[PDB]
Ligand binder design. Structure first.
Ligand SMILES: Nc1ncnc2c1ncn2[C@@H]1O[C@H](CSCC[C@H](N)C(=O)O)[C@@H](O)[C@H]1O
Ligand code: NA
Ligand code: NA
Length: 274
């Protein structure tokens, strides 16, 4: 299982920057932010989407909880952790978990470029093993799971949430983005529905704060077709590996989004007080 994930994300980050943007954010974007000046890049749409999730989780309210420890589960190429270090300058502990050694090497380089290595800790760790993270005595105020659970089988997703719940502070937020199938059954010719997806979280003990389609189907399609155009512009001789797979997937996934067969969801849950 884990070797397949490692193979998927082992490619040169410089090639990925040409495909998905300089920030290497890989869970779509929003094209509706009044602060965005068109044309809207993948970097811009991705960050504005993440900012909208933090807004929906209550972090623009002046009396939100003090963000003292952060976890990013499946932290990709590390820009969400960089953004969060800038967003919460008083947060002196941000932890990233990832199975991809190539992505973690890039994360360490990005964080070192910004002098963030004393605030951001990196762990080569499966999501199911978050119970192994150091200092259980300091719970997490904010946990990010951005485009990761779609890579998990149902047993792994349930096991990971069971491991995560004790590590979240009461009143702390888990801010999730994932790619779901809108209906349980489609014509014959890691599938999760919204009801199933939310029930894993509430069964684990979390309380729903907000769940909605975000980005919109047409915004996810825009992100995919802009990434496809980037790959075709920057690899005119032909793409290889995961970037060729993304180029092909962009059209098929965009069609499914236009037909409303699949959507991307923002899912925010909190740990309740005992
Ligand atoms: N079981 C697992 N445990 C930890 N990380 C996992 C995982 N399965 C997938 N991943 C990681 O999940 C990420 C999916 S891509 C999304 C990356 C990042 N969160 C972003 O929003 O840009 C990759 O970093 C991949 O290596
Ligand atoms: Na390159
Ligand atoms: Na690896």
């Amino acid at each position: 299982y884990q070797r397949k994930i490692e193979t998927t994300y082992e490619g040169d980050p410089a090639d990925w920057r040409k495909a998905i943007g300089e920030y290497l954010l890989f869970q779509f974007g929003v094209y509706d932010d009044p602060r965005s000046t068109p044309p809207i890049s993948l970097d811009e749409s991705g960050i504005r989407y993440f900012e909208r999730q933090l807004h929906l989780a209550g972090f623009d309210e002046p009396d939100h909880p003090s963000v003292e420890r952060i976890l990013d589960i499946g932290c990709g190429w590390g820009y969400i952790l960089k953004y969060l270090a800038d967003r919460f300058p008083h947060c002196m502990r941000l932890d990233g978990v990832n199975v991809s050694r190539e992505q973690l090497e890039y994360c360490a380089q990005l964080h070192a470029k910004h002098g963030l290595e004393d605030r951001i800790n990196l762990y080569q760790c499966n999501a199911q093993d978050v119970d192994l993270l150091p200092d259980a005595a300091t719970p997490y105020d904010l946990v990010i799971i951005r485009g990761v659970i779609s890579h998990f089988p149902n047993a792994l997703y349930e096991k990971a949430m069971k491991a995560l719940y004790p590590r979240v502070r009461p009143g702390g937020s888990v801010v999730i983005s994932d790619n779901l199938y809108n209906v349980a059954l489609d014509d014959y010719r890691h599938r999760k529905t919204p009801d199933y997806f939310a029930k894993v979280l509430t069964d684990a003990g979390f309380t729903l704060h907000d769940m909605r389609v975000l980005p919109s189907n047409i915004d996810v399609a825009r992100w995919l077709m802009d990434s496809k155009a980037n790959i075709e512009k920057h690899f005119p001789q032909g793409a290889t590996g995961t970037l060729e797979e993304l180029r092909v997937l962009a059209e098929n996934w965009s069609v499914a989004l236009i037909k409303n067969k699949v959507s991307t969801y923002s899912v925010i849950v909190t740990r309740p007080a005992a």
